[PDB]
A paper describes a structure:
Polyubiquitin chains regulate diverse cellular processes through the ability of ubiquitin to form chains of eight different linkage types. Homotypic Ub polymers of eight different linkage types can be assembled in which the C terminus of a distal Ub is attached to one of the seven lysine residues (K6, K11, K27, K29, K33, K48, and K63) or to the N-terminal M1 of the proximal Ub. Of the atypical linkages, K29 polyUb is the most abundant in resting mammalian cells (Dammer et al., 2011). Our work shows that K29-linked polyUb adopt an open conformation and are recognized by the NZF domains of TRABID and has revealed the use of NZF1 of TRABID as a tool to study K29-linked polyUb in cells.
Numbering used by the authors:
A (entry chain G): 6 to 32
B (entry chain A): 1 to 73
Write the structure that this text describes.
Amino acid sequence: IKWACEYCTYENWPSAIKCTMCRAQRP
Amino acid sequence: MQIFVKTLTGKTITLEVEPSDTIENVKAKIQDKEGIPPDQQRLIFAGKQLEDGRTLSDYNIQKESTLHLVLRL
Ligand SMILES: [Zn+2]
């Protein structure tokens, strides 16, 4: 279910619309 | 928006967060200010525990709301 950030590769929750670590917008 | 996190010691942290932010994300912001890592953080609002996967909007946490931080559960 979790999505990997394109930039920092951190795995975020489905509910999130931005990376928790780098705060990049979700694709 | 702006919210407050009350520690067990008595300290009150102030966080700038948006309602779209996940509880996990809030814990990351608490790590930034207080140096405690998210695995140890437990956030309590309205007498219940808040899941890392859900947003602040899901729990009806609004401007000026106060959450309680607990460590290691
Ligand atoms: Zn990232």
